[PDB]
Design a binder for this molecule. Sequence first.
Ligand SMILES: [Fe+3]
Ligand SMILES: [Fe+3]
Ligand SMILES: [Fe+3]
Ligand SMILES: [Fe+3]
Ligand SMILES: [Fe+3]
Ligand SMILES: [Fe+3]
Ligand SMILES: [Zn+2]
Ligand SMILES: [Zn+2]
Ligand SMILES: [Zn+2]
Ligand SMILES: [Zn+2]
Ligand SMILES: [Zn+2]
Ligand SMILES: [Zn+2]
Ligand SMILES: [Zn+2]
Ligand SMILES: [Zn+2]
Ligand SMILES: [Zn+2]
Ligand SMILES: [Zn+2]
Ligand SMILES: [Zn+2]
Ligand SMILES: [Zn+2]
Lengths: 167, 167, 167, 167, 167, 167
Amino acid sequence: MLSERMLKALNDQLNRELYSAYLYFAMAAYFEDLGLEGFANWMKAQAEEEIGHALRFYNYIYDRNGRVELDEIPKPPKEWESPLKAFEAAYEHEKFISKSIYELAALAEEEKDYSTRAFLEWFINEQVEEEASVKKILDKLKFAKDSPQILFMLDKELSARAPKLPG
Amino acid sequence: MLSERMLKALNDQLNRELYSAYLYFAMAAYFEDLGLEGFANWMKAQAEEEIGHALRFYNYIYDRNGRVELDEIPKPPKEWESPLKAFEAAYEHEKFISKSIYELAALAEEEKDYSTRAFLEWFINEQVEEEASVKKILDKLKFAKDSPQILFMLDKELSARAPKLPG
Amino acid sequence: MLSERMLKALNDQLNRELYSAYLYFAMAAYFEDLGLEGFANWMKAQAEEEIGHALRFYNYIYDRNGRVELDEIPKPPKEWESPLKAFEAAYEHEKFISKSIYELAALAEEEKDYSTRAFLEWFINEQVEEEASVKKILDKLKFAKDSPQILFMLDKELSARAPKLPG
Amino acid sequence: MLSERMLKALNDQLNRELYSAYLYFAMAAYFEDLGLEGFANWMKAQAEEEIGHALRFYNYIYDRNGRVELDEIPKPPKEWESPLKAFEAAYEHEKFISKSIYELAALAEEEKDYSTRAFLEWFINEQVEEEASVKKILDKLKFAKDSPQILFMLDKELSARAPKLPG
Amino acid sequence: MLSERMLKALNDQLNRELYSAYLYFAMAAYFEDLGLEGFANWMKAQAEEEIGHALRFYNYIYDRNGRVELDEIPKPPKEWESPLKAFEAAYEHEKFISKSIYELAALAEEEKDYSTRAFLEWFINEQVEEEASVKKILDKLKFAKDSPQILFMLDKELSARAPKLPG
Amino acid sequence: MLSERMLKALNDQLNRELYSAYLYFAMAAYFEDLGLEGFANWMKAQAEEEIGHALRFYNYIYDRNGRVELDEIPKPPKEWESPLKAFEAAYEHEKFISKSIYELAALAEEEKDYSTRAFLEWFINEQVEEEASVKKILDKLKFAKDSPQILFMLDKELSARAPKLPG
Ligand SMILES: [Fe+3]
Ligand SMILES: [Fe+3]
Ligand SMILES: [Fe+3]
Ligand SMILES: [Fe+3]
Ligand SMILES: [Fe+3]
Ligand SMILES: [Fe+3]
Ligand SMILES: [Zn+2]
Ligand SMILES: [Zn+2]
Ligand SMILES: [Zn+2]
Ligand SMILES: [Zn+2]
Ligand SMILES: [Zn+2]
Ligand SMILES: [Zn+2]
Ligand SMILES: [Zn+2]
Ligand SMILES: [Zn+2]
Ligand SMILES: [Zn+2]
Ligand SMILES: [Zn+2]
Ligand SMILES: [Zn+2]
Ligand SMILES: [Zn+2]
């Protein structure tokens, strides 16, 4: 009841979700280097979120009697020219995630796989939130061009989102 | 501060920690496919603990004015002949991770880098617990040779260890 | 990420929701004039619900990086031959809102805009409830054809539903 | 609002759902005879759930202004070869139900009936869970093969899911 | 310990009880269609109660080390000429179950099966209540011949009895 | 108790207040697009306040045995040159609502309509407040001519005022 193609598509997205976690952990390291602790914790918190998304693929796969197969998680970028560029890369990446979700949806429909299509709805909706939440901070960063002081207030704002795990 | 050498080593161990998380996750998938849910959650909680180890390194690197750099995380193995052998693999893996920390401690000593050596004390003590805790379940698995009854009983026992993340 | 046609379809529906609100408000004034406070309050409530529905479109548009544009809200009918007929109007209107949601859904499907189709799923479900609730009352007003004592009893039953805004 | 065909199909499913209630009640009786109270209760609980599923259909039909019509509910099988074969037949049954939901979902997509399709989503997702929890127990049963000890421990484990009605 | 004939006659009644539920379920549909939610909900609660009667037999059968066997459940009528007539049908049905119970108690007496006669005492008392409670609504319904207003008010009263299951 | 003149004047102001709501809603959209979420929520809060003003007129018309008649609501402006320009437009709207109210005061005194004039005393006092609260912010925006720093700190202050209804 998972086709061979579907299963592979699902394990691929699971791998994509794990890669996103690593990308954000990477940006976390990057902002930590800048001394933007607030940004760093925001990004660690976003990594954990992505781990969560992978678990959803992981559970659905097992629920349909599939087998999960873990793949390498690529080396994420080390650096960005700026917090702005880093968020632009996050936004570009979220768009990439979405695109792959639509393709999975398109695949489920093409296979008349109602179950998988339906499981994907959650992701279609989540990605809307994901894209908006990155874009919002991205635009705020545009708005703070030659302004250290704003970057600092944004940092302080963003420190409100802390990773759950270190506890 | 940190020599260039010391920092490559810390970074490299950091990625070993991340690799273990991933290894344990793979073991989790393996047990899950076997319908051993208790084993699977124990492995996921282990996975999480490894992320915590990574983060200790991450934090120490930054305290010392260093820069985390994150490498690819190689595809773990997908499969094992048996619950027992999975745990034999885990026990070997912790043994290896303990050899890594010895190596790193020795490097610290050679460099007269007291701080890193001090930092590593925590891991020398942690690894004693890690190895011991893996050994306990391994022996129980040896004890359960050809007795599904006991395997079932062990699955339940280990279901008392849960990943904090899902909620 | 919203097509120019879609943003238009969405802004239009938003507007349609505000006009629903205004119509129900007109119906409140009608009942208020008949001294049927229970009906009048019920409509003030529905009016608020509809504003809510509009706000949902507004939020979604901004989330997908869109721009809401507000249009004129047309003058609603002042008067109805009777309670029953007013509810006959309200029902038909709900059916018109329903068909315009279905056309948006179909548009989203034509365009392969999965986000927008997933968002419309909420309104598809909502309208099922909306029609069923106007129909239930419509039907009791049929059953009270020339029997004021029942009209009086319904009015009291519907005062159960309060508009939230006055306090 | 409901095509004559859609209604026939919805009522058809409603009846499938009661038959499921009844089939699980047959199995409950079967397990009670074997002296397996845990299994038996699990099934009574499942029977209740299926009645819940029929009510989901009843309510949707009335929201949509159609008319429920009840049919005869066939005699279920009295007996199975073993706990395992009984759970295999439940698994096959759940598969047959899932296929009924899909065919219905298809019918709705063909009729451009967006309200009925949206209604059915709940069941699409529900069936995933349904098939999954039968499977999980069906494997627990395969893994018992020649072991009263384990079937006993399973019976106890399942006794934790109790039917509500008795209260 | 139960005679073949007794065992059939108990299982026979089990099936008669389940049919009751099924019949009350039809009436609930019937009322529901008419717009009378109170009467509908009353009938579902009644249906729910009849399932409890089936169960009492079921448990008694296994208590006596017998084996329940479930038979087809006939299609109930779809419609009645009026709520009163539906109530007349329910009254006539409860009168039917009672006789069934008297006949059952008689056979137990003839066969000198004290235990089953003892078990049936509960039903003899229950039917008095069953029959009385239906008659009472039946009469209130006679009292309301050509009066909608009372059908309304009655409906409201009945609504106070709610089926447990949906919760 | 109301002159055909008064009834018209009041219905007119009713309609003016409703257009006010819409004007501020439009402005909320303008700010939302700027990514100024505080400003946008403040404008929604102001929007709901205007609907309140609307209701006040409504209730009063009905207390004097009048009949409310709703008019079309004109399309408001889509945009402004700047946050400052938008508040200059807002202020200048409040002055126009003020003048409108003063004219009703005069109209009601012109025909010795004591009740309506005393009713209006609430609005004369409310408008003093409305204008001061818009002026306060308008000035604050002047004082921050070219200063994203300050425009950002302001946005944060105004976020403390939230629309009530979402809920
Ligand atoms: Fe998210
Ligand atoms: Fe440990
Ligand atoms: Fe609603
Ligand atoms: Fe379920
Ligand atoms: Fe009773
Ligand atoms: Fe004010
Ligand atoms: Zn994700
Ligand atoms: Zn994401
Ligand atoms: Zn470790
Ligand atoms: Zn370890
Ligand atoms: Zn609406
Ligand atoms: Zn509506
Ligand atoms: Zn079902
Ligand atoms: Zn089911
Ligand atoms: Zn009974
Ligand atoms: Zn009865
Ligand atoms: Zn005002
Ligand atoms: Zn104002």
